[PDB]
Structures are given as C-alpha cells and as structure tokens.
Structure 1
Amino acid sequence: AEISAVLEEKILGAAPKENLEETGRVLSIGDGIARVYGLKNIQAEEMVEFSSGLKGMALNLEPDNVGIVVFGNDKHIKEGDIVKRTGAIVDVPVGEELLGRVVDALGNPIDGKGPIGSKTRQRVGVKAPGIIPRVSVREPMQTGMKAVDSLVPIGRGQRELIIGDRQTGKTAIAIDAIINQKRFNDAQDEKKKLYCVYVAIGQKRSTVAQIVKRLTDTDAMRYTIVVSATASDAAPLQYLAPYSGCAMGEFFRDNGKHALIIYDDLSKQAVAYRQMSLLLRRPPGREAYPGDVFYLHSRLLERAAKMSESNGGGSLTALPVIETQAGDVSAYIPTNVISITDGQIFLETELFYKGIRPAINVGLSVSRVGSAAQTRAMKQVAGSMKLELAQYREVAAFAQFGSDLDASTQQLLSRGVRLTELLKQGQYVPMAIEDQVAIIYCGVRGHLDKVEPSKITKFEKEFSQHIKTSHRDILDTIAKEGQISPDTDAKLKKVVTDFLSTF
C-alpha cells in the first residue's frame, strides 16, 4: 500500500494509533465494490459493517487492500469511511417460524408481518454431505402433473433441472409442485409431508407479489418460505439468496423432514456473480463468465440429497430453473447445470403454442433416478407409456407425407395422439397420484382408441368423477393393493366400457 498518507507516516516514522487489524478505511468505492485499506485480521468470505450501517462481504484478500461486495446501494459508502469486521461469515435464521413468511436474502422479513422468532441461525457456506451419509433416492416427490410424474419422475433428494426458453412455463411447473404438497401436508402421515422453499432471483416485485398471492389463495403459503432477491436488489443479495434458501431447506433436511427448494432462476444468480467477478477484476472466460461459475453451481447443488436413516432420514430436493436464449442449450451456464444435475425437464415454445401444455419435450428430458422415484402403479403404467410414446415418435418421424400407411403404423400413430392429448394439463390444477395412474392406465390400455382426442380432457373431466362417486371400491382396492392386479384390470375395463357406453 503506497498512498500519500502512508508514505508521509512512513518517512517520518509516525506509527499511527489506528489499529487496522480489526477495522479499516475505504480506499475506493464504486458500483458495489469497495477497496478497503486495513482489516489485517479479516478472513475470506467474512461479513463487515460500514459506517452507514450497510453490510458487506470480503471476497478478495489482496496484499494491498480488501475487496468488499456491498449489500446495498453504494451511495451510502464514501472513501475513507470506517469499516468494522463482524468476525463471522454470513448466516441466516432457520426454523419453522419462516414458514409463511416472505424474507429477503439475509432473512429479514419483507411482508410486513412483524419479526421472526427464530432461535437458530445457520451459515450459508456449509460443506455438502459426503458419499457416506447419503443414501439412494427412492421416495417420490410428486409434482402433481402427468407429463412429469410419469415420464421424468422426481425423487426426494434429487437435483432436477427445469430448463427452457422465456414464457414457456418453468415457474408454472415449480408453483404447481409447491401447490401439490397441500394434499400431503394436510394429511396425518408425517413422512409424506414436504415443506417448500421458493427463491426468486432478479424478478420484479409485482411478479413476487403475484406468486405470494397465488400461494395464499391456494393455502400453500402455510408450509412455504419465499426468499426474495428482486431486480432492484444488490448483486451480492441475488448471489447469496440461493445459499440462504438452501440453508433454510437444510434445516428441514437435517431434522428428519423433507424439503423442496426452487431456484427461480439460477441464470440470474450466475449473471449477478459474473457482475461481481468482473468488477473485482477477476479474469473472465467464455461469455465473460469466471472460471469458478461451474464451481459456484456445483457447490450449491451438491447439498441437495436425501440423508441416510442414521442421519434422521430427511431429504432435500432441488429444482433449479434455467432460462435458455433461443433454445441454445450449448451455452456455458446451461451446459454446467446440465452436467451437475441428475436430469433435466426441457420446455419448448413450439410445443407450448401447439396446445401441448406443459410443453415438456419427452425426448430431451431425462430423469437419472428413473422408476425408483415412482410408486408401483405409476411405474407400471409409465413403463408402457414411455415405450408407446417412443414408438409414436419413431413412426411419426416418417409420417408427414404418409397417407396410405400400414394398419399397425396407424394404430401406433393414433395411440400416440391419444397419449399426447393425455399428457396435457391445465395450470394451477395439480393432480393426485391415483388420478394420474387411472387416467394413464386408460390411455395406454387402448380404452381411448375409439374416443375422439378432443373429448379426452372432457373424459378426464368426467371419468375421474365416475370412479370417485359410483366405483370407489375399485379405487380402495387399488390403494390397498398398491398395484393393478388383473382382476382389478378387468373390473376397470368393465367400468370404462360402461362409462363409454354412457359417454
């Protein structure tokens, strides 16, 4: 450090009385980056407090100065202001008291409902569990949508990516997954409950207000924490919001409970971290991103797992969201998150405007856990359904100009049309697992080959009412047995034929 004051006090041997070991002065401040002289006993990733009451984090420990990312507007910070180290890394409150509350990236409530009575706080930089304490994923995390609970199943403790373009329905999938858990949280079985965390990163305040209104109207807010880092917030807040939400979910995971975290979206966190790294003069790489932008998301998403029965048995399933520009999944951040997560759910604009909502591209969407993340009845019907969909895709790849096709090819094409109309689902209406099993079973057993596809949703709107009113004993038999026995298959076929006679 060679400034005029330092050179003046070193030529004269002044030995100034300001002990800069536990404090410091600002050399320069700009765009949320503060270079601070002093703080000799500071440590990496440590919180500091400025003279105006603002907080900051030390990210660069250079031999000359300290690089601080400012958690707020940099207008309050001036050159030469006093910075005091807090002595601790960033921590956020955790507990059951955060359920129903809308908090920011630091845990401060912003809904105006008073304080939070949390008795425990967890740091955000916690090491992920190793290979030993975690166990294989087998508990189903039911999204509530037929296109995803059958073809791309998600298990408790799995990092499942929701990747797509703008205005395709990634937030719709996440919110519907949050809403679906009201069926289990209102029940008495404790192991089936799932507490939700939604982390909004970079969105406008009207969008977050609409999300909170949607969760309040559907009574899904009672088990949901919303961590908000809006567009007008600081880049360190948007960078740190996924880690604070992960710590909030890790409280439930480490206490034997099951938590589901949505990061909407990790692209905004990558942009915020890119801005902080570029303004800290770190060397950029591909698409101006730093070399640690893979390590950032891998460190975040490696903490989402299901613990073993010796560690309480709790789980943490993560649903990161990635926005893709014009369908280019070969970009840096989509490639990194795809290589990190245990599968992806791909959404396409062409499928969305074609009527297929949710617009899940079945061919490009993988779930690495697979049938282990399904119940037995759903596995039984989805195993045939994915094969029939694959056969339909293979025969429709060469059926655009084909008119005088084979009878088997026409049957496969008709079955694929019925299944494609079966996978469509409206917004804000999650479905129970038994309804999905029954409807997919009717689709893949040939019961809808004689039914016009445009009435299939109406058939879905009516046949589910028929078995819930006049043939509930079949549903009770399915629930108690847990599988579609051939006797129950024959009874369901008789019910379907009677209903189609009535239809």
Structure 2
Amino acid sequence: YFRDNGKHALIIYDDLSKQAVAYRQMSLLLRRPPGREAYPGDVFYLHSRLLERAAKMNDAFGGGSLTALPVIETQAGDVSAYIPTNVISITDGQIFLETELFYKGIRPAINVGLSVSRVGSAAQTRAMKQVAGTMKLELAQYREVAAFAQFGSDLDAATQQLLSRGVRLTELLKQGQYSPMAIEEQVAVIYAGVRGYLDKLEPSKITKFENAFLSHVISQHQALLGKIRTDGKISEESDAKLKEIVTNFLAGFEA
C-alpha cells in the first residue's frame, strides 16, 4: 500500500522457517510429493514470490519502497541447508548471527565475514563511508590475523596494530537492545576507534568510553552532530573539529 503510495514501508517476516514447515504440513496432507527434507518442491517459489514483492519503485511510480527483513532459523549453523540457501538465493544479503559469538559476549553476533549486502552500500550514508569504510578495512586485517589456537605468541608491530585496532573496533560495534543510535552518533563513536583515539586505552574501557563519550558529544556538541546529520558528509571543518572534540575528551576521560 505505502509502496505504491510513494511512502516507504518495512516488513519483517519472523520467521520464514516456520512458514516453510507450515506449508510442508499442508503439502504432505495434500499428499504432494516430498522432496529434500520432505519439503514440497515449490518452497522456493513460496519464498521467491513473497520476497520478490519487496522492491524500490522509481519516481515515475511514486518512488515508494518495501524493505523486507526475513528471518531464517538454521540448525547447527548449517547455512548450506535447503531452506537457508533458498532464501539466500532470493534476498540481496544476510546477517549471520553465530551462536559462539553470542555466548562469547559479541552482541550483535554478526559474523562480519559471511554477512553481505549486495545492493545496500550505495544507500549507505556518505558519513559512514568516511569512517566505517576504513573500519571494515581494519576489521578485515584483524580477521586475517586470527586462528583457533588462541594460545599463540604473535608479534610484529604491523600485525600487532591490526590486532589492537581489531579488538577495540569489535568492542565499539557491541550494542545493547532497545537502544538504537542515530547515524551521526554512529559515525562519531566509530571515528574514535578508526582514527585510533582508542589505541591508547584498555579494551575493557572501550565500552565505557562509548557510554561516556557519546553523551559527551550529544550534549556539548549538538552543533557538530547536527552538521554531520544535515550534510550527511563530514566536512574537513567538522573533521578537524571532531578531532579536537575527541582529544579534549581523551585528556579528561576518567577510568
């Protein structure tokens, strides 16, 4: 409705896995031939026709849009199971939430290595590219210098910094429920780590830094945040300005 009325809507299917089983119950009762996992040979089309509706209409057709966020429940993390892969071959990206990371305290447990967004980067705010862009690069390097053998004496200043940045950035990406953050606030807290204002700080204090520096810029820096929010791009002025802002806080951040 909203889509074809120039408005924008968001629909969340929680979850398409249970729908698939429900459709399976129906199919099997209908005596329809059971395929892989006894699922009817059209569960794909079941989800394809559905998700296909989510689209971005051009100006001529109102310019509306319907964003879809389907949820899929895997088993033992097998993201190669029929249903999962099927939905994966329909959506334009996924966000893999690893159980290990959840128990490990990483919340949201987003596996930054499997999660992808085929058509979404072009919709990312410029301000984000200016900070998150270089962030993922650092997180890529950190991810590279890793192994299951946690007990590994690694050194080399180069790789060391990659690890130092990595752990801090990871702590920066940690976020609680019911507390969404404005884009301008995001680029600000991300800016801290990316530029390395957290390199000379204990990993534990990083979280505390966020829950202190954030309110610090929200309050005594509504002007700066407002600029980045309106421009949607951190200007050199706002950049150097933020440089001072964070530095002043670092000189007074109590631990």
TM-score, length of structure 2 as denominator length: 0.95
* 1:220-369 equivalences in 2 (<5 Å): 251-369=1-119
Taking structure 1 as reference, are residues 448 and 288 closer, same or farther at Cα in structure 2, changes over 3 Å only?
A: same
Q: CA 1:327/1:404 → structure 2, altered by over 3 Å: closer, same or farther? A: closer
Q: Distance in 2 between matches of 1:398 and 1:408?
A: 21
Instruction: Determine if the alignment matches structure 1 residue 378 to structure 2 residue 134.
Output: no
- Cα displacement (A) at 1:458: 1.7
Residue matched to 1:499:
249
Shift of 1:402: 3.5
Percent identical:
85
Task: Trace 1:409-424 onto structure 2 (pairs within 5 A).
Answer: 409-424=159-174
* Superposed CA offset, 1:432-490 (max 9, x none): 11111111111111111011121222211111121222233322332343322233222
SS in 2 for 1:451: coil
Q: How many residues end up aligned between the 2 structures?
A: 253
Q: Does structure 1 residue 477 correspond to structure 2 residue 217?
A: no
Q: Tell me the residue number matched to 1:50.
A: none
User: In structure 1, what is the Cα distance between the partners aligned to 2:44 and 2:231?
Assistant: 46
Q: Structure 2 vs 1, CA of residues 484 and 402 (structure 1 numbering), >3 Å: closer, same or farther?
A: same
8 Å contact 2:185–2:225 — kept in the other structure? Answer: no
Mapped contact 2:185–2:218 kept (Cα < 8 A): no
Normalised by the size of structure 1, how large is the TM-score? Answer: 0.49
Give the counterpart letter for 1:468 in structure 2: I
The farther-off stretch of 355-364 and 366-375 is 366-375
TM superposition shift of 1:430: 0.9
- Tell me how large the CA RMSD over aligned residues is: 1.5
CA pair 480-318 structure 1, distance change in 2 beyond 3 A: closer
Q: How much has 1:401 moved relative to structure 2?
A: 4.1
Q: Could you tell me how far 1:427 is from its partner in structure 2?
A: 1.2
Unmatched runs of 5 consecutive residues or more in structure 2 = none
Pick aligned residue for 1:407 from 141, 157, 160: 157
Pairing of 1:38-53 with structure 2 (within 5 A): none
SS in structure 1 at match of 2:96: strand
Q: Compute the displacement of 1:370 (Å).
A: 3.6
Q: Which amino acid aligns with 2:56?
A: K
> Partners of 1:351 and 1:263 in 2: how far apart?
24
Which structure: larger Rg? 1
Match of 1:141 in 2: none
- For 2:177, the equivalent position in structure 1 comes to 427
Matches of 1:433 and 1:371 in 2, distance apart? 15
Cα deviations by residue, 1:105-156 (Å, 9 ceiling, x for unpaired): xxxxxxxxxxxxxxxxxxxxxxxxxxxxxxxxxxxxxxxxxxxxxxxxxxxx
Runs of 4+ with deviation above 4 angstroms: none
Q: Which residue type is aligned with residue 453 of structure 1? A: P
Equivalent residue number for residue 176 of structure 1? none
Q: Distance in 1 between matches of 2:66 and 2:231?
A: 29
Q: Which runs of 5+ in 1 are unaligned?
A: 1-250
Read off the aligned partner of 1:463 and give its amino acid letter.
Answer: F
Residues 6, 63 of structure 2: 8 Å contact kept: yes
